[PDB]
Amino acid sequence: YYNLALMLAGVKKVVVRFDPQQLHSTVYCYTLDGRFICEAECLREYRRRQKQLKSATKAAIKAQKQ
């Protein structure tokens, strides 16, 4: 996402407010302290790790139990 007000004033981090249905178009940026800045226009993954971690747990746990 992008806007001119983001480069034109003081900001490093920003909180993004959105509607899941509208993520493809318009979001609204807020400062870390809650002040509205402007809106910005738009110009299984980690579960594999979770599962692999689960197996590497269970096998090691049974092996430690015996």
Place this chain on the structure above:
Amino acid sequence: YYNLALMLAGVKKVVVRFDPQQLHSTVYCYTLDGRFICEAECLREYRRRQKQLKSATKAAIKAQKQ
């Protein structure tokens, strides 16, 4: 442990009967089917693995939960 009767007849595997207090001296060998053969004279470890396995479980589990 050792005995002459062990090399002098048919055996591959043997069940050892013992008294924890007498392990340093005399044990009694039995066949896999329970027949007494003779006695034999005597001529933290895995917990480190268990603990390491425990840590590698817990860290991965919290990481999968978040």
Place this chain on the structure above:
DNA sequence: CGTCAACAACACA
């Protein structure tokens, strides 16, 4: 390359 033996996991009681 083929077969066998053991270890590990899953299912069952």
Place this chain on the structure above:
DNA sequence: CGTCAACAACACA
């Protein structure tokens, strides 16, 4: 080599 920043774990509510 020194300092800083972030991530992860443990303890607390």
